Amino acid sequence: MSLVYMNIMMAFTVSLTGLLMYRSHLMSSLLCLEGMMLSLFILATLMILNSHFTLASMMPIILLVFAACEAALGLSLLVMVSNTYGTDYVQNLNLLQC
Amino acid sequence: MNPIILIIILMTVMLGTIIVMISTHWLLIWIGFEMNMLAIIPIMMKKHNPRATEASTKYFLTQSTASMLLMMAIIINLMFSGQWTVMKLFNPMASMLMTMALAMKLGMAPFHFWVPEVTQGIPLSSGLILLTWQKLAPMSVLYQILPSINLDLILTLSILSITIGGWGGLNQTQLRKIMAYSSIAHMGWMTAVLLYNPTMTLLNLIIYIIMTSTMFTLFMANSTTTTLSLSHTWNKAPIMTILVLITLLSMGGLPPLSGFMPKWMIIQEMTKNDSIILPTLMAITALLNLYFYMRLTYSTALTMFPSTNNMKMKWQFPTTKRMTLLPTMTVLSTMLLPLTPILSILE
Amino acid sequence: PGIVELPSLEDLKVQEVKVSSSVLKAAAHHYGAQCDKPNKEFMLCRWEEKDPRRCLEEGKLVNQCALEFFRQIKRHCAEPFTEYWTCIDYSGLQLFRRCRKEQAQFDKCVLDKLGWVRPDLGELSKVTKVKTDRPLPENPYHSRARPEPNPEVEGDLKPARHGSRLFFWTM
Amino acid sequence: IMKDVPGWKVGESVFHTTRWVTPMMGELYGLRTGEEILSSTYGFIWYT
Amino acid sequence: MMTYIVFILSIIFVMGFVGFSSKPSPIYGGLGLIVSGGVGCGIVLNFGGSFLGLMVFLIYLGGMMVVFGYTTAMATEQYNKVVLGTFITGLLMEFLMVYYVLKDKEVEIVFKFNGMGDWVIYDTGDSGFFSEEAMGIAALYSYGTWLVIVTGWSLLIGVVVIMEITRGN
Amino acid sequence: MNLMITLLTNFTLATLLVTIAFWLPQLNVYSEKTSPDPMGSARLPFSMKFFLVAITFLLFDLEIALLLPLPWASQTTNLNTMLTMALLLIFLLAVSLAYEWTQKGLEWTE
Amino acid sequence: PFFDVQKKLGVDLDHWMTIQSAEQPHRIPARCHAFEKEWIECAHGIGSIRAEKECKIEFEDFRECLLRQKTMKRLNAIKRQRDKLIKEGKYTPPPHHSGQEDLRP
Amino acid sequence: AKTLLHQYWDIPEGTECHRKTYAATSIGGASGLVVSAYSVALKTPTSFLEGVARTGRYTFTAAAIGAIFGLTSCISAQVREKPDDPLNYLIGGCAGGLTLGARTRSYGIGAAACAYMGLTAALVKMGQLEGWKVFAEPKV
Amino acid sequence: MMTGRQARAPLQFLPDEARSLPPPKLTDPRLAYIGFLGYCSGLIDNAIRRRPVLSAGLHRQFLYITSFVFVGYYLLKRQDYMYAVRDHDMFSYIKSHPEDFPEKDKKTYREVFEEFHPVR
Amino acid sequence: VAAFLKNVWAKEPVLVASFAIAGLAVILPTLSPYTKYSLMINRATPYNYPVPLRDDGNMPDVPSHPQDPQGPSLEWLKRL
């Protein structure tokens, strides 16, 4: 198949490995998650436009809307834990080990 | 929390589950999943303490990762098939990604690390809602795509889930963590029998739902969240001790109780396909679940732990909790074995 | 698999309608009104056969009819048509509403010289009927034989023999 | 061109059917210069 | 090299993804994600999706990454070896993949990819007096009644949920 | 083609102007300054109001993205369905605004 | 469980999007309408097990329309042989393949 | 991991000691690498040196177990002239268990590992002989 | 397993072919056992709320028994129908494929040979 | 019911105007006699080709030429 498909898959894999290995902050995890969504957007849009599937052109808009609502919920959770601890570090979310 | 807002949010959770169940489009499956998760997040954060926000954060991160993997599998399937009908998949990579996404959503091992912490951090009612209702939609999606599921992957996930759940539940003293590890082992059983006869999976799902609902309803009726606070129940209401004894015996699969029927029919199905080592291993491993159930029954019903002075003050007042459907699911989770051929209604 | 068959370069040889887009647009309504029969025959052949190699001759006839249309325009109404397509060609979007006067002059000239009447609104968008002699393609998708369906359910439903036959249950 | 290679059939269709399929853009302009390729494929999108 | 414009843009896209995925700092990650989103919108525009690319600019970048950087400015108070190491190794795998693609005009990692320019897959015909993607999006109010209903209900419920969980009571 | 030429021209003109605006007084040798906000070292106070208005803007922006194809969608044959769906979407916008209004969401930044 | 609420109730909630060969606005055809139609007219009513083996050639044609790996490979081989012959100097390109053709219409 | 098992079972038993030992060592090293990867993931080490030392220790222990089992089973099949016999695999499993006890430096865990892994290796041999299926394909 | 059967007429508790089957009797032992389950649940409901078990609220226990009997009757109807469908499909497939189900050549014991293992 | 409208129109006139405009927008298209004109104007716009039908022999309604009397007419659109 095509080449830009390979580049978008590799971009998605890079963002997934970024999400799956936290460094210090929760915001970097959210950024990696939203980059994953952006790669999904580009891949689906290219496939739908190249395939001339007319009625599938509405799908990336719904995908963008739902994942941005997801991101709003995640930002609210990040703000709540930052108000609790004074920072958004992932090492402070360890009370539930016990 | 407003009663009306709570009502709207609960109907939104059920609406998301219904949208997943009834739809023939992959995008609608995805939409129902996000609607369900977005609506169920405030049920977890009903009490507004740091543990609930931590549990909600971990749950949100896990479900978002699983959802992105599911969308990846859907887009790969569209690329290699040009359609969106919810049926067998046309790519092994899409099948593997979707199977692991559904495993992450169900919390099966080795993606099990979020289940006990999330169950511990949230109240008993929201934990009941999670561990009972949240698992109806991924098992339905698995029920729709079984021609594309890799057998080795799903069987590995099943045996890993059963062993890890038993070994994890051996060490816990909190009731919610025990319920979480029990859930992990039961989903191991359910997805073990999935590829041979999914009707057995539906029967096991129904029986596990009823037994978990009974145990959680008894827990919120007595307002107990630890082992010792449950052990205080003999000096307050001994009928509840009898009920938790029979329900925990039935949860361990001991005949002639109704919990024996799912693993009995699962072993019956697995031996028809010349698989004998796996059902024996799963039974021997489920002995561990029986072990910590029997430890709970020792601490609660078959011995009298010392109580305190204020239990008299608690004697002078009756209970007023709405123990909804508690006798019905108490009866249905113990004396249902003579009605075993009723499983033909699920085919 | 097979070898795709293409017509030779002599079969694709025809003299073309070598006019620009605005020249075609100025006389588009009269071209649709006058040369409708071979155009609709070609379009019916095109939508039925789903193969341009089976519609090459109809396209050739379409070219011949269009060339004769423009030759008939050139014989009598060269100057008003030239002015009309010039003022059509000036416009960026090639509007029909910026050149009403020259359009009326060209229409009047071609009505009194050739008896041609331009169509009204919605006339050229009608669905017409075509009398042709080429036979209908009985299998235009080149589809092969469909698989035979499974046998269906027949007969009245009877109770199960000795019930469920599940272990010791007698029902 | 395709003469030296053994086992090559000139004009072999890739599909199992004899139905006419609309040619790819790379099937038409694949043997031509890059200017015509740019003017045909990206010509409409890039036009102002 | 001008026929490889979408391929070059995809290379810039994945390079920006490597850069922001190394997690140097949340604000620098946001900047890298903004640049990557702009390049991806360029990819979509060069493929023919004007409306979807302008949705990416209007909603993802102008409407949502603003919220991400706005929250990033309200935390992570203003003033490494790991970041440089992963950036270098990601650039190395990326350029190794490019060299292996362009040297042999074919590659297989999980699926099989072809190293020719991506102008080959395009359609040779015209769409008439309309654009196909605009008609497909516009069919949302005529065909996608159910999609509109579930999306609007999810958005309203999201408003209610966000108001519920940030109150603290 | 012409569009990205214009984009490059605007970008290089802006960066040329910024470079001249920065580095031209750098050629001056004026002086060296030591220089030893009303708040000295106070932490930025986290305000829920600004985050709330940001999230409300984001959600309304999403429903705006839903509302955007209305001029194209008005050309459909199914006019009753399109009118009903458009009115339902803007009614959901109004209902979300009213729920934010009544529950003191727009408070102290009204 | 897949509760077919739509078939029981007669509503059409997501069947319009579910395939590419369905009813599209303004009668716009897709690139692989014919191949998908032939594959669906195969697989209808025989189950997945029979349709995975019986007329698989329709699905191979559909997949070749969708992704076009064989056409890309054939073009790659033709262009590679052309490049080798051009470099070794025993092939001269024709005038119409170098931009000196003055195309038909 | 599929090709390692086939390349181990392609060699006839009691025929090539070196190649059987090499295949068993490769399988053991792969399993030890998986165990070490999960160990350094879930239980993070104090430094890079501690993590690489733990990785080397686990991989070497598993590889030594595999090599000892393969060599002992192949030698016992060669001596006894009984290639298809689970007693040779029982002897090899006990040898691997004793190697595990030697690596951990305690006698009791070594004896228990001898008994249990000898029984396990014997069961694997019986399953290979009788065609027992562990991940059985659906049939009915 | 039987989704192809329950695919042409979905979401039906009891299709029209089920009415050709004999309904369960009201003296069915399974129905009586389900009524006993309802009575036991009524007694537990009396017990957990600290009421006299066998005396308090006879209307509640009667509604428990009635509800259990109703739901159990309909479930039993569905169960009998689905086993009937199973047998019908099995016999139709056996009759339609005679090559795969040959008649076994039965032999009397005077011709068959069985090894004898003495117990001594 | 009557003084409430006067009070709310003296106090919040912006909300009164908004709700009145909304009510007009939601009840007027169901009441106007020009909605059918919008319907048959949108459905009479020729986006794609009117593919002809093969003449079997029985189509008196279908014209054989655009200028033939039979067929749909847009005189109502030309006059309105």
Ligand SMILES: CCCCCCCCCCCCCCCCCC(=O)OC[C@H](COP(=O)(O)OCCN)OC(=O)CCCCCCCCCCCCCCCCC
């Ligand atoms: C193939 C299968 C397809 C699907 C088939 C159907 C599946 C049904 C699955 C049922 C899942 C139940 C989920 C959990 C209960 C949902 C209702 C709820 O929200 O309950 C919690 C609620 C919280 O209120 P609150 O007052 O805060 O409680 C704290 C204690 N004071 O209220 C309370 O806590 C009140 C206290 C009593 C709660 C009792 C709830 C019982 C629910 C389970 C009933 C039995 C299962 C359903 C029937 C059998 C299904 C197989």
Ligand SMILES: CCCCCCCCCCCCCCCCCC(=O)OC[C@H](COP(=O)(O)OCCN)OC(=O)CCCCCCCCCCCCCCCCC
């Ligand atoms: C049904 C029609 C279509 C409906 C959907 C479309 C609606 C479009 C407009 C959307 C408006 C969204 C926001 C609405 C908020 C209303 C609630 C509100 O603000 O109540 C508070 C306000 C009193 O103000 P206060 O409490 O002091 O707040 C600080 C500001 N002063 O309270 C008030 O000022 C009183 C507000 C309620 C009464 C308004 C009555 C208007 C009547 C107009 C004539 C009738 C129009 C026809 C429709 C029927 C209306 C009942």
